[PDB]
Ligand binder design. Structure first.
Ligand SMILES: Nc1ncnc2c1ncn2[C@@H]1O[C@H](COP(=O)(O)OP(=O)(O)OP(O)(O)=S)[C@@H](O)[C@H]1O
Lengths: 140, 558
DNA sequence: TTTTTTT
């Protein structure tokens, strides 16, 4: 079993305060250039049209049902593809392969929800229309 | 071999003239000092260069002709020579078929600005076992300017079986945007709907044109796509390689001219290049262009500072001929005549599956002038929204897509006729217009213009219009935007004693002749002394400005 | 999600 398959926990990063930065960030949506991908940011705004929380599939278990093994499919993308009838170590090199199917109790989920953030309408230019932006929320 | 020869030749030419070199020197020194101040107390400029068409003409007409004829061979190597130097240092109407595949200068109007999406160019990928990074790029027809083989799928497991973990931060991105520019409408042929094309911008120029401005555009006419030879009229077009195009003695003249005491009158008579009389009317247009002061209250709401005037009068007193003077003299105005349905007070959001917005007439004229013609002839539908626009300075649009709330603090001028005929003083002072009652208190000045028949006046109208058929304006708008940034005023004690007695006059005797008397009128009493102080560029508020405003109230109503 | 009707 991979250790990613057995986690039960999560890890959260932690931002630095501006006081120690003063000793040793106020951004706008317009200031969010589409070139800062992968960086660390800090925004502010208005929560608008909050969606609802629905479960997110993480890993897929696959019961052998013939040889009695368990095949595992980890999915980090939005979609994926179905796999074969069995991927056991014993179903292979044999005439009669198994037949798998997924399972619910052996799969792992995660909290997933998103919403939209509207501009402050005080930092908006005099002749523009305010934009909005999607922010994903996960876990705790 | 050809590319390096063009590179070294233009590099030699760029090394020939050091005038641009010290410019890049100032670029690098400024960005260095900007990062220096940003990294010392707390504990922007791009790389594109304006090259005049000056020296390229005095060096090689072969190379000159090559730039304006085949730019797809000389702009990339010239930029290559520039980047090498940077590293060493440290009309639409006649536009088709011919005036094609060159660099074209286009003029027109900024309209219907599209949405901002970023685009990926350089990928960074980390392999686990080798412990190394990688490299992979992708190009499209917007970026290359040359017909190269397109290399589109996001890579993983290339050579040995090493996991190509992609990385970020270091992977580069560039924004992307397309806009449409139709030519200027007055330039059009005998009578037609103007026709248009579009031009695509790049990274440092995203969101520089809003729908509704005046813009000169310099770029390169690029045609992409398989023109129907894919699988019936193709070869759709666009424009790339773009730039954006919207004194001390003069400002000393401004400071020197402003040292007078009667320029308000001089400018008052200046703004009547073809209209006889109506002296105080011109004075009121000066005060509208001044715009007044804005004083947002402590933890309350803002208070509107501009002034709005609608007219009524006999149908021959330049009612519609005063309007275009205000159109050309002010800045960023849009004239509305007759109907205004579905788009004056709203945006309507009719636009991938999404909801976008197009700024309406009241919103686009923010910090500007709204010219409204035939206010009574406006249908009764939008009349409800006009109260909201004119009083709360906001527009709330709540359609099925998304309810929103925004800001527009526009100045508005309207011009209406009496209800029937010329009976403007005959019947009763009230309801010669048949407008809602709240609009009376909403508007600031209400002019009643007669067509009084006399003879001195008759002869003067005759010689004015007759010699018409057989100090200046550009000095004025410069005087306006210069008077905007340092002449902002503040109220004094002397401003109170006059307008208090004046408001007492408004309630004790003004009601005996006409109506209404609101506190908004007292706000205009403050605003007029404010605008008079902006025109004289004073900092305080004087008693004399209020003395002027008393005559402005008498001339506007009594 | 907006343009020509009529009780
Ligand atoms: N004092 C004046 N000086 C010069 N031209 C004037 C003057 N008064 C009127 N005009 C004439 O104003 C005419 C146009 O008048 P308009 O105001 O457009 O008539 P109108 O019917 O009120 O317009 P609308 O928009 O239909 S109400 C032009 O021919 C000008 O010569």
């Amino acid at each position: 079993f991979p250790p990613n398959l057995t986690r039960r926990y999560f890890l959260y990063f932690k931002p630095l305060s501006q006081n120690c930065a003063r000793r040793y960030k106020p951004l706008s949506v317009r200031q969010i250039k589409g070139d800062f991908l992968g960086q660390l940011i800090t925004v502010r705004g208005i929560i608008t049209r909050v969606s609802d929380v629905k479960p997110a599939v993480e890993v897929i278990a696959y019961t052998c049902d013939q040889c009695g093994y368990e095949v595992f499919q980890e999915v980090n993308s939005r979609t994926f593809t179905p796999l074969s009838e069995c991927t056991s170590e014993e179903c292979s090199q044999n005439q009669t392969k198994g037949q798998l199917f997924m399972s619910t109790r052996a799969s792992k989920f995660s909290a997933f929800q998103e919403c939209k953030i509207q501009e402050l309408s005080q930092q908006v230019p005099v002749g523009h229309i305010p934009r909005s932006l999607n922010i994903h929320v996960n876990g705790t | 071999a050809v590319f390096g020869d063009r590179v070294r030749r233009f590099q030699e030419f760029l090394d020939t003239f050091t005038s641009y070199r010290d410019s890049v020197r100032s670029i690098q020194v400024y960005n260095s000092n900007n990062a220096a101040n940003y990294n010392d107390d707390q504990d922007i400029l791009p790389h594109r260069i304006i090259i005049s068409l000056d020296d390229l003409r005095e060096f090689d007409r072969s190379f000159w002709s090559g730039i304006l004829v085949e730019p797809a061979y000389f702009i990339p190597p010239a930029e290559k020579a520039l980047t090498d130097l940077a590293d060493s240092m440290d009309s639409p109407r006649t536009l088709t078929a011919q005036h094609l595949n060159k660099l074209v200068s286009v003029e027109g109007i900024v309209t219907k600005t599209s949405l901002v999406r970023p685009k990926l160019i350089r990928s960074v990928h980390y392999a686990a076992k080798t412990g190394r990074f990688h490299y992979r790029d992708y190009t499209d027809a917007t970026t290359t300017l040359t017909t190269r083989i397109p290399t589109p799928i996001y890579p993983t497991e290339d050579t040995e079986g090493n996991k190509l973990t992609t990385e970020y931060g270091y992977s580069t991105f560039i924004d992307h945007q397309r806009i449409t520019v139709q030519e200027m409408p007055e330039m059009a042929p005998a009578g037609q709907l103007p026709r248009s094309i579009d031009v695509i911008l790049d990274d440092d120029l995203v969101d520089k044109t809003k729908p509704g401005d005046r813009v000169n555009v310099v770029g390169v006419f690029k045609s992409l796509g398989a023109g129907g030879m894919n699988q019936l009229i193709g070869f759709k077009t666009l424009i790339l390689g773009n730039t954006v195009y919207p004194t001390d003695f003069d400002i000393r003249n401004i400071n020197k001219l402003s040292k007078k005491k009667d320029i308000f009158d001089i400018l008052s008579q200046s703004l009547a290049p073809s209209i006889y009389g109506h002296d105080h009317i011109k004075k009121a247009i000066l005060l509208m262009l001044m715009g007044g002061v804005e004083k947002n209250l402590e933890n309350g709401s803002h208070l509107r500072g501009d002034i709005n005037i609608l007219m009524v009068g006999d149908p021959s007193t330049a009612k519609s001929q005063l309007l275009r003077f205000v159109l050309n003299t002010a800045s960023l105005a849009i004239a509305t005549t007759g109907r205004g349905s579905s788009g004056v007070g709203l945006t309507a959001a009719v636009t991938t599956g999404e909801r976008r917005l197009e700024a309406g007439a009241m919103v686009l004229a923010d910090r500007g002038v709204v010219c409204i013609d035939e206010f009574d002839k406006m249908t009764d539908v939008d009349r409800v929204a006009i109260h909201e626009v004119m009083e709360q300075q906001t527009v709330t649009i709540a359609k099925a897509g998304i309810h929103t709330t925004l800001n527009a603090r526009c100045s508005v001028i309207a011009a209406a006729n009496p209800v029937f005929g010329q009976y403007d003083v005959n019947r009763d002072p009230h309801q010669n217009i048949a407008l809602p009652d709240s609009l009376l208190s909403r508007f600031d000045l209400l002019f009643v213009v007669t067509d009084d028949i006399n003879e001195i006046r008759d002869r003067s109208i005759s010689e004015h219009v007759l010699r018409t058929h057989r100090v200046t304006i550009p000095f004025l708008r410069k005087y306006v935007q210069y008077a905007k940034e340092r002449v902002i005023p503040q109220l004094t004690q002397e401003a109170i004693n006059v307008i208090v007695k004046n408001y007492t006059d408004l309630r004790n005797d003004d009601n005996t002749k006409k109506s209404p008397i609101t506190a908004r009128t007292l706000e205009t009493l403050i605003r007029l002394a404010t605008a008079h102080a902006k025109v004289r560029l004073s900092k305080t508020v004087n008693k004399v400005d209020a003395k002027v405003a008393a005559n402005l109230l008498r001339f506007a109503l009594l």
